[PDB]
């Protein structure tokens, strides 16, 4: 029903990340659910000002919900109180942490 | 390293809940990690207004962190940006949801 | 399915209103859906400051949702972005307005 | 006095939408009030970040007021506390919901 992943958590580094059309992010979420999140970092919602992006009308991976989190494409302006953070393509340093995630 | 639990999520009902000395909540967390959370509900932090308690100076079970969550005694006024919600003893209804938790 | 109602809208007057247990507000919602809202006023969420009650752990009628609104018991601290306002027992002045409502 | 409509509600998808001179939106509101809102979506005000347009000095259909809502041309910058959302021409999916609307 869900899967555990190790993901690098970025709470310190300003990053400029790629965004993609909705259907592309759906596909990349499915890829990462199968293969893991190497090449991505998790930015907690409370550090969202670390994330810059050139096409903010396009999407990044969102992590949403209570408990085991759902993954779905979101804008960086996503205002839901259930937003945990974003999983974005970046090569900065951080702290590897354990997540438990499912596809929305 | 962690354990999955099904916990009733309460986002609708006001609950008056017991708080306890810090050391007692530590023991209650261990018991619940072993035996499950029947009779408790998870109240997300954005609905902290739902939760009231007798002893402002005593603690409830806090759910903290990014990813798989840590369990630790917290005050109901805990301001940490890492606070996900509370697990409190209450008899109200809710929605059963999956959690992945570890002892802090 | 839903019903249209004329309801006095209060955007100006401070009101002290009764709050009730959840089950009681459910019954009051059903009564008002059958018989109308005379004796109540609608306070829009943007003037929620106008409403006070002596039991802040008890409920009033909430008006929520997009389009035809749902009616359900809420606390005066209800933070949902879907909250339109409250329907509360009060005898103040206001502007009579047309609503379209259904029971949640 | 008013009419009920089924309208696709969009809370998920970024939409680049046409904006028009004020007088043209007046006429489009009249047409849609007669013929329905097929091809349009309702974006709630709390997801106004989803909507972009080319001419930010030109207008879209605004949904305003307490209760049965008024339809009136607005800018996407519309600051009124009575703004419920926008009805905009867009291709995306959504959730069909019932509305009760009148022309301002």
Short mmCIF file of C-alpha atoms in Angstrom, two decimals:
data_model
loop_
_atom_site.label_atom_id
_atom_site.label_comp_id
_atom_site.label_asym_id
_atom_site.label_seq_id
_atom_site.Cartn_x
_atom_site.Cartn_y
_atom_site.Cartn_z
CA UNK A 1 0.00 0.00 0.00
CA UNK A 2 3.00 2.25 0.66
CA UNK A 3 6.79 2.16 0.59
CA UNK A 4 9.63 3.37 2.82
CA UNK A 5 12.29 5.61 1.26
CA UNK A 6 15.48 7.32 2.35
CA UNK A 7 15.46 10.92 1.07
CA UNK A 8 17.94 13.74 1.60
CA UNK A 9 16.27 16.54 3.57
CA UNK A 10 17.24 20.11 2.63
CA UNK A 11 16.57 22.71 5.32
CA UNK A 12 19.56 24.99 4.66
CA UNK A 13 20.34 25.50 0.95
CA UNK A 14 18.68 27.84 -1.50
CA UNK A 15 17.96 25.74 -4.60
CA UNK A 16 16.73 26.57 -8.10
CA UNK A 17 14.77 23.55 -9.32
CA UNK A 18 13.06 22.37 -12.52
CA UNK A 19 9.28 22.29 -12.79
CA UNK A 20 7.29 20.24 -15.28
CA UNK A 21 3.78 19.82 -16.73
CA UNK A 22 1.30 17.94 -14.56
CA UNK A 23 1.39 14.68 -16.52
CA UNK A 24 5.20 14.67 -16.50
CA UNK A 25 5.33 15.01 -12.71
CA UNK A 26 2.82 12.14 -12.42
CA UNK A 27 5.25 9.99 -14.41
CA UNK A 28 8.28 11.07 -12.38
CA UNK A 29 6.36 10.27 -9.17
CA UNK A 30 5.70 6.77 -10.49
CA UNK A 31 9.38 6.41 -11.48
CA UNK A 32 10.56 7.49 -8.02
CA UNK A 33 8.05 5.24 -6.25
CA UNK A 34 9.62 2.32 -8.12
CA UNK A 35 13.26 3.40 -7.98
CA UNK A 36 13.76 5.84 -5.09
CA UNK A 37 14.52 9.53 -4.85
CA UNK A 38 18.21 9.70 -5.72
CA UNK A 39 18.82 13.12 -7.29
CA UNK A 40 16.00 14.76 -5.31
CA UNK A 41 15.80 16.46 -1.92
CA UNK A 42 12.83 16.97 0.40
CA UNK A 43 12.21 20.59 1.40
CA UNK A 44 9.81 20.91 4.37
CA UNK A 45 6.89 23.26 3.86
CA UNK A 46 8.21 25.47 6.67
CA UNK A 47 11.39 26.03 4.56
CA UNK A 48 9.58 26.55 1.26
CA UNK A 49 11.28 29.89 0.61
CA UNK A 50 14.47 27.90 -0.12
CA UNK A 51 12.93 26.74 -3.41
CA UNK A 52 13.20 28.97 -6.48
CA UNK A 53 11.93 27.99 -9.90
CA UNK A 54 11.87 29.60 -13.33
CA UNK A 55 8.41 28.27 -14.36
CA UNK A 56 6.17 28.62 -11.32
CA UNK A 57 3.12 27.84 -13.46
CA UNK A 58 4.53 24.28 -13.62
CA UNK A 59 4.68 21.58 -10.99
CA UNK A 60 6.98 19.83 -8.53
CA UNK A 61 6.36 16.75 -6.42
CA UNK A 62 4.18 17.53 -3.42
CA UNK A 63 4.07 15.52 -0.19
CA UNK A 64 0.64 15.81 1.46
CA UNK A 65 -1.49 14.42 4.24
CA UNK A 66 -1.59 13.03 7.75
CA UNK A 67 0.44 9.92 8.55
CA UNK A 68 1.81 8.04 5.55
CA UNK A 69 2.00 10.85 3.00
CA UNK A 70 0.47 11.08 -0.48
CA UNK A 71 2.54 12.15 -3.49
CA UNK A 72 0.97 14.36 -6.16
CA UNK A 73 2.03 17.23 -8.46
CA UNK A 74 1.72 20.68 -6.88
CA UNK A 75 2.63 24.27 -7.55
CA UNK A 76 5.20 25.87 -5.28
CA UNK A 77 2.35 28.20 -4.16
CA UNK A 78 0.30 25.23 -2.88
CA UNK A 79 -1.54 26.55 0.23
CA UNK A 80 -3.09 23.35 1.61
CA UNK A 81 -2.71 22.93 5.37
CA UNK A 82 -1.96 19.28 4.57
CA UNK A 83 1.19 20.15 2.58
CA UNK A 84 4.22 18.56 4.26
CA UNK A 85 6.81 19.76 1.75
CA UNK A 86 8.21 19.34 -1.74
CA UNK A 87 10.46 16.75 -3.39
CA UNK A 88 12.55 18.65 -5.94
CA UNK A 89 15.51 17.88 -8.21
CA UNK A 90 18.64 19.34 -6.59
CA UNK A 91 22.20 18.31 -5.75
CA UNK A 92 22.75 20.20 -2.49
CA UNK A 93 23.76 18.65 0.82
CA UNK A 94 21.37 17.63 3.57
CA UNK A 95 20.36 14.99 6.09
CA UNK A 96 19.19 11.57 4.93
CA UNK A 97 15.87 10.73 6.60
CA UNK A 98 13.30 7.92 6.40
CA UNK A 99 9.91 8.54 4.75
CA UNK A 100 6.84 6.36 4.18
CA UNK A 101 4.99 7.43 1.03
CA UNK A 102 2.16 6.38 -1.28
CA UNK A 103 0.92 7.63 -4.63
CA UNK A 104 -2.15 9.87 -4.37
CA UNK B 1 13.34 0.97 13.25
CA UNK B 2 9.71 2.08 13.04
CA UNK B 3 6.22 0.61 13.06
CA UNK B 4 3.02 1.15 11.08
CA UNK B 5 -0.26 1.87 12.89
CA UNK B 6 -3.87 2.50 11.96
CA UNK B 7 -5.11 5.49 13.97
CA UNK B 8 -8.45 7.33 13.95
CA UNK B 9 -7.86 10.88 12.70
CA UNK B 10 -10.05 13.55 14.33
CA UNK B 11 -10.44 16.80 12.41
CA UNK B 12 -14.02 17.63 13.49
CA UNK B 13 -14.69 17.02 17.20
CA UNK B 14 -13.70 19.05 20.23
CA UNK B 15 -12.04 16.78 22.79
CA UNK B 16 -11.13 17.31 26.43
CA UNK B 17 -8.13 15.06 26.93
CA UNK B 18 -5.98 13.97 29.88
CA UNK B 19 -2.47 15.32 30.22
CA UNK B 20 0.18 13.63 32.33
CA UNK B 21 3.66 14.21 33.77
CA UNK B 22 6.43 13.97 31.18
CA UNK B 23 7.75 10.65 32.50
CA UNK B 24 4.27 9.08 32.41
CA UNK B 25 3.74 10.08 28.77
CA UNK B 26 7.11 8.48 27.98
CA UNK B 27 5.80 5.20 29.41
CA UNK B 28 2.43 5.56 27.67
CA UNK B 29 4.20 6.04 24.34
CA UNK B 30 6.14 2.80 24.89
CA UNK B 31 2.93 0.92 25.75
CA UNK B 32 1.13 2.28 22.70
CA UNK B 33 4.09 1.51 20.41
CA UNK B 34 3.83 -2.10 21.58
CA UNK B 35 0.04 -2.46 21.75
CA UNK B 36 -1.48 0.06 19.30
CA UNK B 37 -3.52 3.22 19.71
CA UNK B 38 -7.09 1.95 20.24
CA UNK B 39 -9.01 4.57 22.19
CA UNK B 40 -6.75 7.39 20.96
CA UNK B 41 -7.24 9.79 18.07
CA UNK B 42 -4.73 11.82 16.05
CA UNK B 43 -5.53 15.54 15.90
CA UNK B 44 -3.43 17.33 13.25
CA UNK B 45 -1.66 20.47 14.36
CA UNK B 46 -3.84 22.66 12.16
CA UNK B 47 -6.82 21.57 14.30
CA UNK B 48 -5.06 22.09 17.64
CA UNK B 49 -8.05 24.31 18.52
CA UNK B 50 -10.07 21.09 18.95
CA UNK B 51 -8.01 19.93 21.94
CA UNK B 52 -8.47 21.21 25.49
CA UNK B 53 -6.92 19.94 28.69
CA UNK B 54 -7.07 20.29 32.47
CA UNK B 55 -3.37 20.71 33.27
CA UNK B 56 -1.71 23.28 31.01
CA UNK B 57 1.67 22.29 32.46
CA UNK B 58 1.40 18.58 31.63
CA UNK B 59 1.93 16.65 28.43
CA UNK B 60 0.25 14.69 25.66
CA UNK B 61 1.71 12.46 22.94
CA UNK B 62 3.31 14.63 20.25
CA UNK B 63 3.93 13.56 16.65
CA UNK B 64 7.01 15.36 15.28
CA UNK B 65 9.40 15.57 12.36
CA UNK B 66 9.73 15.04 8.64
CA UNK B 67 8.95 11.64 7.15
CA UNK B 68 8.39 8.78 9.57
CA UNK B 69 7.36 10.68 12.69
CA UNK B 70 8.92 10.70 16.15
CA UNK B 71 6.72 10.27 19.24
CA UNK B 72 7.62 12.47 22.21
CA UNK B 73 5.72 14.12 25.08
CA UNK B 74 4.76 17.72 24.26
CA UNK B 75 2.76 20.53 25.77
CA UNK B 76 -0.42 21.39 23.88
CA UNK B 77 1.11 24.85 23.19
CA UNK B 78 4.29 23.37 21.64
CA UNK B 79 5.27 25.81 18.84
CA UNK B 80 7.86 23.74 16.97
CA UNK B 81 7.46 23.87 13.19
CA UNK B 82 8.13 20.10 13.29
CA UNK B 83 4.91 19.38 15.22
CA UNK B 84 2.59 17.26 13.08
CA UNK B 85 -0.20 16.77 15.60
CA UNK B 86 -1.16 15.07 18.84
CA UNK B 87 -2.25 11.55 19.74
CA UNK B 88 -4.74 11.95 22.59
CA UNK B 89 -7.07 9.62 24.47
CA UNK B 90 -10.62 10.41 23.36
CA UNK B 91 -13.73 8.43 22.42
CA UNK B 92 -14.93 10.46 19.46
CA UNK B 93 -15.33 9.27 15.89
CA UNK B 94 -12.84 9.91 13.11
CA UNK B 95 -11.30 8.55 9.91
CA UNK B 96 -8.96 5.57 10.16
CA UNK B 97 -5.62 6.38 8.52
CA UNK B 98 -2.21 4.75 8.25
CA UNK B 99 0.77 6.12 10.19
CA UNK B 100 4.45 5.17 10.38
CA UNK B 101 5.91 6.11 13.76
CA UNK B 102 9.02 5.69 15.89
CA UNK B 103 9.95 6.52 19.46
CA UNK B 104 11.98 9.73 19.68
CA UNK C 1 -31.34 17.98 -2.51
CA UNK C 2 -30.99 21.57 -1.29
CA UNK C 3 -33.28 24.40 -0.21
CA UNK C 4 -33.38 28.18 -0.59
CA UNK C 5 -33.72 30.30 2.56
CA UNK C 6 -33.99 33.97 3.46
CA UNK C 7 -31.59 34.73 6.34
CA UNK C 8 -30.69 37.96 8.11
CA UNK C 9 -27.01 38.75 7.49
CA UNK C 10 -25.09 40.42 10.35
CA UNK C 11 -21.85 42.16 9.36
CA UNK C 12 -22.03 45.00 11.88
CA UNK C 13 -23.26 43.98 15.35
CA UNK C 14 -21.40 42.17 18.11
CA UNK C 15 -23.48 39.21 19.32
CA UNK C 16 -23.23 36.84 22.29
CA UNK C 17 -24.69 33.55 21.11
CA UNK C 18 -25.43 30.13 22.60
CA UNK C 19 -23.23 27.18 21.71
CA UNK C 20 -24.37 23.61 22.13
CA UNK C 21 -23.15 20.00 22.11
CA UNK C 22 -22.47 18.53 18.67
CA UNK C 23 -25.59 16.33 18.61
CA UNK C 24 -27.78 19.27 19.62
CA UNK C 25 -26.50 21.45 16.78
CA UNK C 26 -27.16 18.58 14.35
CA UNK C 27 -30.79 18.53 15.48
CA UNK C 28 -31.03 22.32 15.28
CA UNK C 29 -29.66 22.16 11.71
CA UNK C 30 -32.34 19.64 10.76
CA UNK C 31 -35.05 21.75 12.41
CA UNK C 32 -33.93 24.88 10.55
CA UNK C 33 -33.65 23.02 7.24
CA UNK C 34 -37.33 22.09 7.66
CA UNK C 35 -38.62 25.36 9.12
CA UNK C 36 -36.25 28.20 8.19
CA UNK C 37 -33.83 30.33 10.14
CA UNK C 38 -35.97 32.95 11.88
CA UNK C 39 -34.29 33.80 15.18
CA UNK C 40 -30.83 33.25 13.65
CA UNK C 41 -28.43 35.50 11.76
CA UNK C 42 -25.62 34.68 9.33
CA UNK C 43 -22.23 36.15 10.27
CA UNK C 44 -19.75 35.93 7.36
CA UNK C 45 -16.37 34.45 8.21
CA UNK C 46 -14.66 37.78 7.55
CA UNK C 47 -16.57 39.25 10.51
CA UNK C 48 -16.15 36.21 12.78
CA UNK C 49 -14.82 38.66 15.40
CA UNK C 50 -18.47 39.71 15.94
CA UNK C 51 -19.44 36.38 17.52
CA UNK C 52 -18.76 35.44 21.13
CA UNK C 53 -20.08 32.55 23.19
CA UNK C 54 -19.64 31.37 26.75
CA UNK C 55 -18.83 27.73 25.87
CA UNK C 56 -16.03 27.94 23.30
CA UNK C 57 -15.69 24.15 23.48
CA UNK C 58 -19.27 23.84 22.13
CA UNK C 59 -20.61 24.30 18.62
CA UNK C 60 -22.59 26.65 16.38
CA UNK C 61 -23.96 26.09 12.87
CA UNK C 62 -21.22 26.31 10.26
CA UNK C 63 -21.75 27.13 6.58
CA UNK C 64 -19.03 25.54 4.43
CA UNK C 65 -18.10 24.72 0.87
CA UNK C 66 -18.14 25.99 -2.69
CA UNK C 67 -21.44 26.69 -4.43
CA UNK C 68 -24.50 25.50 -2.53
CA UNK C 69 -23.17 25.37 1.02
CA UNK C 70 -23.12 22.50 3.52
CA UNK C 71 -24.38 22.97 7.09
CA UNK C 72 -22.53 21.24 9.93
CA UNK C 73 -21.62 21.97 13.57
CA UNK C 74 -18.36 23.89 13.99
CA UNK C 75 -16.37 25.60 16.69
CA UNK C 76 -16.01 29.37 16.48
CA UNK C 77 -12.27 28.71 15.92
CA UNK C 78 -12.97 26.61 12.75
CA UNK C 79 -10.01 27.36 10.43
CA UNK C 80 -11.12 25.63 7.21
CA UNK C 81 -10.62 27.71 4.08
CA UNK C 82 -14.07 26.41 3.09
CA UNK C 83 -15.80 28.23 5.98
CA UNK C 84 -18.30 30.78 4.67
CA UNK C 85 -19.65 31.92 8.03
CA UNK C 86 -21.77 30.96 11.00
CA UNK C 87 -25.53 30.79 11.58
CA UNK C 88 -26.08 31.78 15.21
CA UNK C 89 -29.09 32.51 17.43
CA UNK C 90 -29.30 36.30 17.84
CA UNK C 91 -31.91 39.06 17.65
CA UNK C 92 -29.85 41.86 16.07
CA UNK C 93 -30.52 43.86 12.91
CA UNK C 94 -29.15 43.00 9.48
CA UNK C 95 -29.87 42.66 5.77
CA UNK C 96 -32.15 39.85 4.65
CA UNK C 97 -30.36 37.80 1.96
CA UNK C 98 -31.01 34.66 -0.10
CA UNK C 99 -29.08 31.45 0.61
CA UNK C 100 -29.06 27.97 -0.93
CA UNK C 101 -28.11 25.33 1.64
CA UNK C 102 -27.96 21.58 2.21
CA UNK C 103 -27.20 19.37 5.20
CA UNK C 104 -23.63 18.06 5.29
CA UNK D 1 -34.29 35.56 -9.24
CA UNK D 2 -31.47 33.01 -9.48
CA UNK D 3 -30.58 29.76 -11.24
CA UNK D 4 -28.83 26.54 -10.28
CA UNK D 5 -25.85 25.30 -12.30
CA UNK D 6 -23.54 22.29 -12.25
CA UNK D 7 -19.97 23.59 -12.60
CA UNK D 8 -16.64 21.76 -12.59
CA UNK D 9 -14.66 22.93 -9.56
CA UNK D 10 -10.88 23.15 -10.07
CA UNK D 11 -8.69 23.11 -6.97
CA UNK D 12 -5.70 21.28 -8.52
CA UNK D 13 -4.73 22.51 -11.99
CA UNK D 14 -2.89 25.64 -13.03
CA UNK D 15 -4.90 27.33 -15.78
CA UNK D 16 -3.91 30.10 -18.20
CA UNK D 17 -7.23 31.74 -18.97
CA UNK D 18 -8.54 34.46 -21.31
CA UNK D 19 -9.39 37.85 -19.84
CA UNK D 20 -11.63 40.30 -21.66
CA UNK D 21 -12.79 43.92 -21.58
CA UNK D 22 -15.34 44.59 -18.86
CA UNK D 23 -18.24 44.97 -21.32
CA UNK D 24 -17.40 41.62 -22.96
CA UNK D 25 -17.47 39.74 -19.64
CA UNK D 26 -20.88 41.29 -18.91
CA UNK D 27 -22.15 39.73 -22.14
CA UNK D 28 -20.43 36.39 -21.49
CA UNK D 29 -22.06 36.23 -18.05
CA UNK D 30 -25.46 36.76 -19.68
CA UNK D 31 -24.76 34.00 -22.22
CA UNK D 32 -23.60 31.54 -19.57
CA UNK D 33 -26.55 32.37 -17.31
CA UNK D 34 -28.87 31.31 -20.15
CA UNK D 35 -26.86 28.39 -21.55
CA UNK D 36 -24.70 26.99 -18.73
CA UNK D 37 -20.98 26.88 -17.97
CA UNK D 38 -19.71 23.96 -20.09
CA UNK D 39 -16.05 24.62 -20.84
CA UNK D 40 -15.57 26.74 -17.69
CA UNK D 41 -14.27 25.79 -14.26
CA UNK D 42 -14.83 27.42 -10.87
CA UNK D 43 -11.58 28.20 -9.03
CA UNK D 44 -12.18 29.06 -5.35
CA UNK D 45 -10.55 32.22 -4.10
CA UNK D 46 -8.23 30.21 -1.83
CA UNK D 47 -6.70 28.68 -5.00
CA UNK D 48 -6.39 31.96 -6.90
CA UNK D 49 -2.68 31.06 -7.30
CA UNK D 50 -3.82 28.49 -9.90
CA UNK D 51 -5.10 31.15 -12.33
CA UNK D 52 -2.96 33.23 -14.69
CA UNK D 53 -3.90 35.45 -17.62
CA UNK D 54 -2.19 37.56 -20.29
CA UNK D 55 -3.86 40.93 -19.61
CA UNK D 56 -4.03 41.34 -15.83
CA UNK D 57 -5.84 44.65 -16.43
CA UNK D 58 -8.72 42.76 -18.08
CA UNK D 59 -11.55 40.81 -16.54
CA UNK D 60 -12.83 37.31 -15.75
CA UNK D 61 -16.15 36.16 -14.28
CA UNK D 62 -16.19 36.84 -10.53
CA UNK D 63 -18.38 35.01 -8.02
CA UNK D 64 -19.20 37.35 -5.10
CA UNK D 65 -21.33 37.70 -2.01
CA UNK D 66 -22.94 35.85 0.86
CA UNK D 67 -25.47 33.14 0.07
CA UNK D 68 -26.63 32.88 -3.54
CA UNK D 69 -23.70 34.47 -5.34
CA UNK D 70 -23.58 37.44 -7.71
CA UNK D 71 -21.78 37.15 -11.05
CA UNK D 72 -19.80 40.24 -12.08
CA UNK D 73 -16.61 40.92 -14.06
CA UNK D 74 -13.54 41.19 -11.81
CA UNK D 75 -9.80 41.39 -12.13
CA UNK D 76 -7.78 38.43 -10.88
CA UNK D 77 -6.43 40.88 -8.26
CA UNK D 78 -9.98 41.42 -6.87
CA UNK D 79 -9.49 42.10 -3.12
CA UNK D 80 -13.08 42.06 -1.82
CA UNK D 81 -13.66 39.88 1.23
CA UNK D 82 -16.85 38.80 -0.53
CA UNK D 83 -14.99 37.15 -3.43
CA UNK D 84 -15.86 33.45 -3.57
CA UNK D 85 -13.83 32.57 -6.65
CA UNK D 86 -13.64 32.87 -10.43
CA UNK D 87 -15.41 31.12 -13.30
CA UNK D 88 -12.82 30.87 -16.07
CA UNK D 89 -12.66 29.19 -19.46
CA UNK D 90 -10.31 26.22 -19.19
CA UNK D 91 -9.88 22.62 -20.35
CA UNK D 92 -8.90 20.93 -17.13
CA UNK D 93 -10.63 18.29 -15.04
CA UNK D 94 -12.32 18.94 -11.72
CA UNK D 95 -15.22 17.97 -9.48
CA UNK D 96 -18.78 18.71 -10.58
CA UNK D 97 -20.57 20.74 -7.91
CA UNK D 98 -23.88 22.57 -7.61
CA UNK D 99 -24.05 26.37 -7.56
CA UNK D 100 -26.88 28.90 -7.15
CA UNK D 101 -26.03 32.10 -9.01
CA UNK D 102 -27.55 35.41 -10.11
CA UNK D 103 -26.38 38.27 -12.30
CA UNK D 104 -25.07 41.24 -10.30
#
